[PDB]
Each structure stands twice: as C-alpha cells, then as structure tokens.
Amino acid sequence: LKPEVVEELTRKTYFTEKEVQQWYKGFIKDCPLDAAGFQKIYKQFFPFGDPTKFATFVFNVFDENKDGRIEFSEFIQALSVTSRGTLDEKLRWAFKLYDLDNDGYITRNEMLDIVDAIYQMVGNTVELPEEENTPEKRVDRIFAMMDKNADGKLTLQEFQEGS
Amino acid sequence: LTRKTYFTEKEVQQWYKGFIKDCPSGQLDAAGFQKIYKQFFPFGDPTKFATFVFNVFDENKDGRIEFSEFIQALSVTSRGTLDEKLRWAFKLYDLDNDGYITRNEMLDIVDAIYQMVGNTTPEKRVDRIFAMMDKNADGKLTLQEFQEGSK
Ligand SMILES: [Ca+2]
Ligand SMILES: [Ca+2]
Ligand SMILES: [Ca+2]
Ligand SMILES: [Ca+2]
Ligand SMILES: [Ca+2]
Ligand SMILES: [Ca+2]
C-alpha cells in the first residue's frame, strides 16, 4: 500500500521510507476516526479526568483541511514536528493549539482554554499529581511575561522568545 | 455475564459492540495502545505514560487487552467509588507490583506525565507530595497512605 506518497511524506516529515510504511500499517490497523470517534476513544483509553475538551482542540489541529477526518497525511506530519521537527517548528506547532480562532494571535482566554483543558485531564484529578497553581493564575503569570507590549495578545515571536 | 461490574447487562452489550468496533481482533496490544497515545499527545512523547497505563489495563499481564480487562477498567475509573478509583491508580504508580509506591516510581509517573505535554520540575514535585503522604517516613507509600493522602 502507498506508492509515491511515501516519497512525498518523507520530504515533509524527515521520517524514513521505512518508517512511513510502518506508521501507515499501524494507522489502518491497531485501534482505529472522526471528531466523535476520537473524542470517545480518548475517554476510554485515558481514564483520568475528562479529556473531552482537549480531545476537541487536538482533533482540530490534526484535521488541517477541516473535512472532519484525520487522513494519514495529516497524522504523519503532526507526529513529525513533535518528534523530528526543529525548535522553531515545534513552537509554531504549539502556537496553532493555543491560537483557537487562527488569526495569528493568542489571547488570554484562548490560552486559558487550552491550559484548562489540559488541567482537567492530569491537573485536577485525584489520581494524578499536579498542579500547584490554577489555569487562572498560571496563564496570568505567563501572559504577563510573554506579552512584552502588553496589548492583551501574544504574537508568535512573543510566544517563541518567551519559551 | 459480568454483573460484577457497575454496568448493567444492558450496558455491557453496548460496550462489547463498541469494542469490536474499535479493535475487531478483540486484542489491542501495546503497539496499538502506544500509537493512539501519540495521537492524544502530539506535543511530546507519551511513550512512557502509555506503557504504564497499558499495564494497569492488562491485568493478567499477557501483553494484550481482552474485553474482560477493558470493561473492568472503565467501570472502576468512570463509576467506581473514590477508594476504588484510588486503588486502580495505585497499580499505575506501583510499577513492580510489590504493594508499595517508592520515591523513584512516583517520579517515573510524574516525569512520564511531564514528557507527554512538555512543550505547551518532576524532582521538586515528587519530594513535595511524597513527604506529605508518607506519614511514617519509611520511603514507601501504602495504598492507605496513598488513598488518605489524595483525599
Ligand atoms: Ca482531514
Ligand atoms: Ca487568536
Ligand atoms: Ca503582544
Ligand atoms: Ca490480558
Ligand atoms: Ca513499588
Ligand atoms: Ca509509609
């Protein structure tokens, strides 16, 4: 399966032509997916807190062409940046998660929406440790630091340098 | 025939329907469990935490998740009492299954959580909660110390 797609998903991911095949072999086999399916599979296999919120945010970054499904092209490239990507690409990858409305800015409420979604999964359970502060207070501390010009919005540059 | 779980036998029918809908082979192994965690945390490396969680699901430790282990795990974690939820979590921390949670084991859990999201310290954090829960200061955590310490 997969012919000259492998060559293409090699130049865009820096995975080898041996790794792209195994990830496809594993993609259609194993466990699996639309938004509903990914959301419920996240609830089943990650039984700590409520992964409902974060599952939605993650799915939307996965589904780049916004068709309601995660094709192999989107999955292998998303996996690429976090595992093989440069620091710049990784911070830009994190930026898309926070930038909910995709306008090139991170607002205080946008960052709060992400932090709180993560907080509900591992930060607020009685089973897993963490945190020490609150998504309310953590975002205020980090926003005050990164927002150099204090305009209430975070650019990619402010986000990158702050990190 | 598992009336032994907080599910009705009307709910059990539906969960098997969903099980064979997910993994039709009836056996999701470590590799399959590992890659979906890659999906659940595409901002780091969920490898460590995926392994730990998988070991708690797979109760008989054969490297596979049968329906029996899957249906019992969902029960305790989603509908179980606080003690039962804390007891199920205890197995996660207790890596070597000796009935204790040691300092490095909990550190192994926290950093595993730290590694999966670490882009968007574990040392100072573990010292804080371990000192709190370990009442007799023997360097080990019992289920009782863990349960009371969490509440
Ligand atoms: Ca898509
Ligand atoms: Ca925005
Ligand atoms: Ca700004
Ligand atoms: Ca098993
Ligand atoms: Ca132990
Ligand atoms: Ca003790």
Numbering used by the authors:
A (entry chain D): 8 to 39, 43 to 173
B (entry chain A): 16 to 135, 144 to 174
Question: What do the authors say?
Answer:
Neuronal calcium sensor-1 (NCS-1) is the primordial member of the neuronal calcium sensor family of EF-hand Ca2+-binding proteins. It interacts with both the G-protein-coupled receptor (GPCR) dopamine D2 receptor (D2R), regulating its internalization and surface expression, and the cognate kinases GRK1 and GRK2. Here, we report the determination of the crystal structures of Rattus norvegicus NCS-1 in complex with peptides derived from D2R and GRK1, as well as the structures of NCS-1 alone and in a C-terminal truncated form. Consequently, in the Ca2+-bound state, NCS-1 folds in such a way that the two lobes are oriented to jointly present a large, solvent-exposed, concave hydrophobic crevice onto which peptide, proteins, and other hydrophobic molecules can dock and bind.
To investigate this phenomenon further, residues Ser-178–Val-190 were deleted to create a C-terminal truncated mutant, NCS-1ΔCT. The solution behavior of NCS-1ΔCT was significantly different from that of the full-length protein. Size exclusion chromatography-multiangle laser light scattering analysis showed that NCS-1ΔCT was polydisperse, with a molecular mass between 29,300 and 42,000 daltons, compared with that for the monodisperse full-length protein of 21,880 daltons. We infer from these results that without the C-terminal region the NCS-1 hydrophobic binding site is completely exposed, causing the protein to self-associate. NCS-1ΔCT crystallized as a symmetrical homodimer with the structure resembling a pair of clasped hands, with the “fingers” of one hand inserting into the “palm” of the other. The palm is the hydrophobic ligand-binding crevice, and the fingers are formed by hydrophobic residues positioned on the surface of the one subunit in such a way that they slot snugly into the hydrophobic crevice of the other subunit. Hydrophobic residues from helix 3 and the EF1/EF2 loop (residues Phe-49–Phe-58) bind to the N-lobe site; residues Val-136–Pro-139 in the EF3/EF4 loop region bind to the C-lobe site. The protein-protein interface buries a large area of about 1854 Å, which means that nearly one-third of the surface of each subunit forms the interface in the homodimer. First, it serves to occlude the hydrophobic binding crevice in the absence of a partner protein and to prevent protein self-association and nonspecific interactions.
